[PDB]
Design a protein around this ligand. Structure first.
Ligand code: HEM
Ligand SMILES: O=C(O)c1ccc(-c2cccs2)cc1
Ligand SMILES: [Cl-]
Length: 393
């Protein structure tokens, strides 16, 4: 009933160009079995969306990586939000929602926007730059650690820690094993910064600790919730902004439309999130036998969702392989869907919007002018190096 495929979605070949294999996975059926890892897979929009929106049946508390927490020990203490199901998920989620809330974005927008304009002005003085190290990495590093309230010392641990976290959702391949081998100094730094005395007043970390007297979380839960923002809050945005710049570099007609109406900046970023999907895949575990898209899956089985594939599924999207900054993007799954849908999406969209606004107002052309190099991670998609020449408007 269910087709068995040998495709390895965690292989370097797949990362280098996932799109043909994703079509093969979608077209094989609504539910496939991946023999390489003994997991079920769903690559169509319909089933990805259905799985995400049934957290009772497709739970997160057994881990959102390949590893089943009922069978193996997690590599670090489980996240109180990502790796929790309702009702345990609900109150920590509400705290992070209020910490990263629509109202909070007002307190940071002016500074985030000025830093984006400043970075684009700096890059234009150099002309030829690496849009990864010099922009996609440099911009979030210039705003997010400060908004968290982190001290300056030790910030070089943040991107390695995040890469470790996202590699650790994969199978026990070399990318994952090597990340864990190297992890001790990054875990040590990150855990220490999560303690209340190490988080500057007014930042996101201090605000999480301030919620420990309302009855929503206790003091001993706050450090792990700070850990969540230090895990998911930087490397995702690096790959999102890198994706947007890569899209504008490859589709100059869309850069021209963005220049002509900079208020398209926010949707141009959302479309980049759909088109490249910085978070490509992750898992749920079944809590019962379940029928999904006409197939029967037993209890206790890992189900791999292909978010990037769902975002390119022609059953859902017109011209899915085109980057279109005026596309109606509502419904894409690049930030997830349902109860776990990205709690930091307003921070991500703010960074992306203000960066693309700066480019729209200040840059006339973005031309790739060197070898493009991909960065390999078990669940994040993005580039290692993107040499571009920026021409001023
Ligand atoms: C372009 C940038 C980003 C992308 C593509 C992205 C993607 C996602 C996705 C797909 C999920 C759902 C995971 C699941 O259902 O298991 C998620 C959850 C989450 N994200 Fe984001 N994210 C981004 C930025 C951020 C930022 C900036 C923050 C914090 C400042 C953040 C914090 C979180 C947290 C804490 C969760 C867990 C929420 C929950 O389990 O209820 N993310 N993100
Ligand atoms: O530590 C945390 O709570 C944490 C939360 C979310 C993530 C993401 C996984 C996949 C997309 S976002 C990773 C870590
Ligand atoms: Cl840790």
């Amino acid at each position: 009933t269910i087709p068995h495929l040998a495709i390895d979605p965690f292989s370097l070949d797949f990362f280098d160009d996932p799109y043909p294999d994703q079509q093969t996975l979608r077209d094989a059926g609504p539910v496939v079995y991946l023999d390489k890892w003994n997991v079920y897979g769903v690559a169509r929009y319909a089933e990805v969306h259905a799985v995400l929106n049934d957290p009772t049946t497709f739970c997160s508390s057994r881990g959102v990586g390949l590893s089943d927490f009922k069978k193996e020990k997690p590599w670090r203490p489980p996240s109180l939000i990502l790796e929790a199901d309702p009702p345990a998920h609900t109150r920590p989620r509400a705290v992070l929602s209020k910490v990263l809330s629509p109202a909070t974005m007002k307190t940071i927008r002016d500074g985030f926007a000025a830093a984006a304009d400043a970075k684009v002005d700096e890059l234009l003085q150099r002309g030829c730059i690496d849009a990864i190290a010099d922009l996609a990495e440099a911009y979030p590093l210039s705003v997010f650690p400060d908004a968290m309230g982190l001290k300056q010392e030790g910030r070089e641990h943040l991107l390695p820690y995040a890469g470790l976290v996202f590699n650790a959702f994969g199978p026990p391949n070399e990318l994952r094993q090597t990340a864990i081998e190297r992890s001790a100094p990054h875990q040590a730094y990150v855990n220490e910064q999560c303690q209340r005395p190490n988080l500057a007043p007014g930042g996101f970390g201090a605000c999480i600790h301030a919620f420990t007297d309302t009855g929503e979380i206790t003091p001993d839960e706050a450090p792990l919730l700070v850990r969540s923002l230090l895990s998911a809050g930087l490397d995702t945005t690096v790959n999102g902004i890198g994706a947007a710049v890569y899209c504008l570099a490859r589709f100059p007609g869309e850069l021209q439309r963005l220049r002509s109406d900079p208020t398209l900046a926010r949707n141009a970023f959302e479309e980049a999130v759909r088109f490249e999907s910085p978070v490509q895949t992750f898992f749920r575990t079944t809590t019962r036998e379940v029928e999904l898209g006409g197939a029967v899956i037993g209890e206790g089985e890992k189900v791999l969702m292909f978010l990037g594939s769902a975002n390119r599924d022609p059953r859902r999207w017109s011209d899915p392989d085109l980057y279109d900054i005026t596309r109606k993007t509502s419904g894409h799954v690049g930030f997830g869907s349902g109860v776990h849908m990205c709690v930091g999406q307003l921070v991500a969209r703010l960074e992306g919007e203000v960066m693309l606004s700066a480019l729209a107002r200040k840059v006339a052309a973005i031309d790739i002018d060197g070898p493009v190099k991909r960065r390999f991670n078990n669940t994040l998609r993005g580039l290692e190096s993107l040499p571009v020449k920026l021409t001023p408007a």
